[PDB]
Design a protein around this ligand. Structure first.
Ligand SMILES: O=C(Cc1ccccc1)Nc1ccon1
Length: 186
């Protein structure tokens, strides 16, 4: 099936806990996969305008590890619950992808999660201005704008709203799209 095929592809790229004990300032992100209308989508947040760093930017749910977290996956799930109301029973964490090194002292670990079809986002307005879906196949043929570095513009056909996706967020979306959709029969 579509979902069994996606999980099987994703498991081949799982690094597991290999880099998780290293002495960095630690953050985790959740790459949330949603199945609608017979296709896979990624769920994104728009950060509240009130926030100190990167107000109004498109991001994945996530944040800083705290002492309560049993592991890096737990960080991603705690932050996702706080930000968009995603409960643990509504997500299956399938794997841990390549971590992102930044600032010389910081390691950001991404986890891909399959999201339950009965989940409905409840944006917490102190942290998140908006939540939206992009079809995973978009990241194979994105509408690119050069700012000089590459920015994706996605327009939601439901309402005509345009979102800008860039940086680590755009990079990870492309990675997930390649892993799941490369070399598939029609
Ligand atoms: O902050 C994140 C993810 C993140 C954290 C740290 C480093 C890179 C990415 N997601 C949010 C926060 C509010 O709305 N979305």
């Amino acid at each position: 099936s579509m979902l069994d095929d996606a999980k099987a592809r994703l498991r081949k790229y799982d690094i597991g806990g290999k880099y998780s004990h290293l002495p960095y300032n630690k953050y985790s992100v959740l790459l949330p996969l949603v199945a609608k209308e017979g296709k896979l989508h990624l769920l994104f947040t728009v950060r509240s305008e009130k926030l100190r760093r990167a107000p109004g930017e498109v991001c994945f749910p996530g944040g800083k590890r705290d002492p309560t977290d049993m592991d890096d996956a737990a960080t991603a799930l705690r932050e996702a619950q706080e930000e968009v109301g995603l409960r643990p029973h509504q997500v299956e964490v399938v794997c841990c992808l390549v971590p992102c090194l930044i600032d010389t002292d910081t390691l950001i670990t991404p986890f891909v999660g399959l999201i339950d079809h009965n989940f409905q986002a409840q944006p917490n307005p102190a942290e998140v201005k908006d939540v939206f879906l992009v079809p995973l196949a978009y990241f194979l043929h994105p509408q690119v704008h050069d700012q000089i570095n590459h920015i994706f513009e996605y327009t939601n056909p439901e309402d005509g709203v345009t979102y800008q996706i860039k940086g680590m967020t755009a990079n990870l979306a492309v990675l997930v799209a390649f892993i799941i959709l490369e070399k598939k029969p029609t």
